[PDB]
Subunit: 337 residues, 3 copies
């Protein structure tokens, strides 16, 4: 019987179905790259209020939101417009992510479409039962006050409809490469975004030297709250030891992590990668967190790495350690006795 056969097949499902949704200009640009470079077992959805930007984007599925409100002509940097446009097209957004076990929402906060629509996409995602994760950036300071204030209000709004919320503050990118021009600024930020999003997705979906169980992934991210990342990599031969230390000292991981529970670790490298190096990585990280933190990790081989091991660290539950101001994220300053 068709129904019964359908029920049996479901039980044989082997991999988690993942969907990546990019909103606004920056988000569509991230999506275009993932589609071209490829992103192991994950469909791509692009959404915009701006028709031209959507046309030049490459993705499995495109949705023009706010057709009646904006008219395919952008949201002009206004968050409230991006939000009403998304609410207006909620039905189409929902049908595009309906069968997903997990949904990644990515965009650069600061403008009108991404900042306004991301929280709406996340709310629809949770309503349908998918693990809902966001990977977004805060704007550079040179972009100015209005852009940051809008980004911060959007981060707040997004926190409420998200399982784990991963924030990358673009301004820290200058601490990685001090004298960089705005030209290459958004090029570096692009790189970081792809590594974070692709690193998390592959950790969950790419066959490695140890199996990572989606049910564990879900248990840790279900209450990931606010999260931050760290990226490091070594070319030497004492690789692991150096990549992890670099990742842990990354300016991107701008928060006190000793009180963290949960964390996801993805160690990448060449054919000669060993569970031994991965383990050294995990334990070095494992000691800086809470003694009872849950850690999810994996290890994958990447041809293009040639002779390097890259380490991606996502540390969760740090919201209590951060302060959300109109001007950005500031490491919290706890009150004396």
């Amino acid at each position: 019987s068709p129904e019964d056969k359908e029920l049996l097949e479901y039980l044989q499902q082997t991999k988690a179905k993942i969907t990546v949704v990019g909103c606004g200009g920056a988000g569509n640009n991230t999506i275009t790259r993932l589609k071209m470079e490829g992103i192991e077992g994950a469909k791509t959805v692009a959404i915009n209020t701006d028709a031209q930007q959507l046309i030049r984007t490459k993705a499995d599925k495109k949705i023009l939101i706010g057709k009646k409100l904006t008219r395919g002509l952008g949201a002009g940097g206004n968050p409230k417009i991006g939000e009403e446009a998304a609410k207006e097209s909620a039905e189409e957004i929902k049908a595009a992510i309906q069968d997903s076990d997990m949904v990644f929402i990515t965009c650069g906060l600061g403008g009108g479409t991404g900042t306004g629509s991301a929280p709406v996409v996340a709310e629809i995602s949770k309503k349908i039962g998918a693990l809902t994760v966001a990977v977004v950036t805060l704007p550079f300071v040179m972009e100015g006050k209005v852009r940051m204030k809008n980004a911060m209000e959007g981060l707040e709004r997004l926190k409420q409809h998200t399982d784990t919320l991963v924030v990358i503050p673009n301004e820290k990118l200058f601490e990685i490469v001090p004298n960089m021009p705005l030209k290459l600024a958004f090029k570096v930020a692009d790189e970081v975004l792809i590594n974070a999003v692709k690193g998390l997705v592959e950790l969950i979906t790419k066959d490695g030297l140890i199996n990572v169980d989606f049910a564990d992934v879900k248990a840790v991210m279900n209450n990931g709250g606010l999260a931050m990342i760290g990226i490091g990599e070594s070319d030497s031969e004492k690789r692991a030891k150096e990549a992890v230390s670099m990742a842990l000292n990354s300016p991107l991981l701008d928060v006190d992590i000793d009180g963290a529970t949960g964390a996801l670790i993805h160690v990448m490298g060449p054919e000669d990668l060993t569970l031994e190096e991965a383990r050294e990585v995990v334990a070095t990280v494992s000691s800086r967190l809470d003694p009872n933190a849950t850690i999810i990790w994996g290890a994958t081989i990447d041809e293009n790495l040639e002779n390097t091991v890259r380490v991606l660290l996502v540390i969760t539950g740090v919201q209590s350690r951060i302060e959300f101001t109109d001007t950005g994220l500031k490491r919290k300053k706890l009150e004396l006795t």
Copy 2:
């Protein structure tokens, strides 16, 4: 014109469209029986969080709920899981009962899928405009405290989204057959459930010796509140007189009925059944209720009955006469002056 022809046809509709929805293990088992034995003009919908149980079930329509939450692997006796799973699949549940004039929701309360999903199915049913009736059982006491507390909380939740709520307390079954083994326990309870559900459905949908008008059915059940049943039957020749007295004295009808408004009576028997016997039944019952109670009744002939008349009594509006405790239903004890 296709539209106009469609509108005319609707006016020619003759019978109420009924749907029976069974949730969880016990509910699916009840559905499997109804489908095989047949149930005059009513489609069958089975829903479960457990794939295996759904596979071995027989029904017109099957829905695996909570696919992302539980993974076709049951709800493990947790009501909150059954509830989120149902909310997660609300769209599919709705489309399955969308065109129903009336919806019957049946399950055994106590576990996780039925207790949690029944109130959700009932809420969707009312939202679409269907007469919403539930026929459920409370667990035996030997099953223990946790199972009863969960059943009671579910009954409460279900009361709020239901037109009339029919409760069968399995523990009373021992007063019918005193020394019975757990083996046959759930076999007796199965029998009772089928007679209640099939008795109500046929009363509404089976051609009898008097026509029962769906609009009257709807008027009485629209405010049936909490309801209880009674079953009796006579083999003698003073049949009617005995079946009704047995039904009225049934341990299943564990409440003071003198203050009841509304009631549904279904008298069943062989080819020799007469409107005379039905009427004696009705009047004997009619005198124990409120002097202004509304009674809906019918009379049908059943080949398999050979030489017996069976009487099904459903007495509504008794909630004020019952006390809902964590440990079960207790006849209420009104406060003195």
Copy 3:
């Protein structure tokens, strides 16, 4: 690519998509006329609780609402029934107006289907993002108190889910034609309704001597609040001057308009119509409103007019100038110092 081609085509869209929805007897009758006489670029949707009335109606789309509640047998003058019936069929109502840039909701308030369902249709319309305008009538006084009280409560309910709400009080029709019989009463009211609805639609959708931009239409009506109309026309040769004065003195425009912002003006006439006459019309009206009022206007040629110019005035934002009583609309009486 199909998606991309689809996105490009959207950018080439030239006209606003308009839908007219008539509810109840009077509304269906208005719809039947619009469909036959034709109504430049606007689809017609008819909805009723009464099957017979829906059958004899002519429209692009018909929807029988409340199929489970009422059974194609009307709502018997009860607003609460009309409302539950509409809520019950919300999904079908929504799909019928889903792709509309603008939605006009018309009916005669006073009975059960129109009064109850109009606010529901308007709420669905706003939810999807369409400009939501209502054009409705208040009953004659000879119809009695109950009919007016129900009409007034419906107007109140409708105000909350509408962008601009246009009210035509049928009782004023006697000031236009003093000694008129009930026979011709509803015939005159029919005429007025068609001119108001068709006048507004054509102003937005009919090619004229000056282009009216939908975006301006939307900006003015977005906050039109309560609106009233005025109709005038001249056969002479000092046409414009007379039509506008007649329109401005119309008993239909029963409110103090000096404090009005926004207004829509549609001047119609024969082949010899000139932007000069239209302009005289606009300026004569423009001086009675607030010095900063926004006015939207157009001018169209109608063959059937032969030698007359007709003027349609819709003046918005007058709610503060009106008093909503159980017995009707009364020009407000501001409180002294």
